[PDB]
Every structure is written in C-alpha cells, then in structure tokens.
Amino acid sequence: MRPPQFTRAQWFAIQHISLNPPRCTIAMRAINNYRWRCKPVNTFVHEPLVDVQNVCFQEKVTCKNGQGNCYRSRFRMHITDCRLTNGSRYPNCRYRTRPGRRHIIVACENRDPRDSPRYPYVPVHFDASV
C-alpha cells in the first residue's frame, strides 16, 4: 500500500525512478521497508526525472483500470524489471534483475499540494512496462 507519509507522486518516484543503475535486491529494500510482504514485481525507469515526468505530455491512452489519464512514452526508455525469487521469504527479499528498453505507460495527475510546485502535472502510477 502507499505509505501515508508519501504523496502518490512521491511514492511513484521512490518505487519507479532510478538515478543510478538499479540492482534489484539492493534497490528494493527501501520499498519493502514500508511493506509487510515482499513486493513480487517492480519496474524501475532508469532515466532522468524530467524525462519520466514528460511522459505525462506524450501519447494519451486508456489505463489498465479504465481511467483515461494514462500516457505512453514517445520513445523506448531504459527500464529494469525486478521479480522476487521463488525462494524469497519475507523479510529477506531477493530479486532477479531483468534490464531492458521499452515504451512505458504511466498514469498522471495534478500535483498534490505537498508535491513540488514546479511540476503541476506528474506521474502517479506505473501502469505497464510495454
């Protein structure tokens, strides 16, 4: 679940934007610290923050949940898919790291008041890795 201390945009960035190349088992720890079971699957976008934010102005598409506020990246982006190993037992979560470069789809919305006023419309959910 989203920890209440983070806005939707903040949690999206924590889970899905990687400045440095992600090694899944290391990078997932900050996420699973807020959880009570290992996150089974998680995608990181390894691109500058502004490039990920800018997907919110690209190709508008229907979201998997039926909402209309999703967008598909114009270009393939560098991503890393993290999948929990079959032997992992919470709280010790290990991941397989599957890098790639694909179009992404994100949901976007107006910023929360607790989000930076410099980005009025921001990504809040990772919808798809293709």
Numbering used by the authors: 0 to 129
Text taken from the publication that reported this structure:
Based on the structure-function knowledge of the RNase A superfamily we have engineered a chimera that combines RNase 1 highest catalytic activity with RNase 3 unique antipathogen properties.
While in RNase 3/1-v3 there is an extended β-strand, in the first two chimeras the C-terminus end is disordered, determining significant changes at the B1 pocket. Interestingly, an equivalent distribution of PO4 anions is obtained in RNase 3/1-v3, where phosphate n° 3 is located at the active site. In contrast, RNase 3/1-v3, thanks to the absence of the extended and more flexible L1 loop of RNase 1, might have a reduced protein motion and hence a reduced catalytic efficiency. Two additional variants were later designed, where variant 3 combined the best of both parental proteins, achieving similar antimicrobial properties to RNase 3.
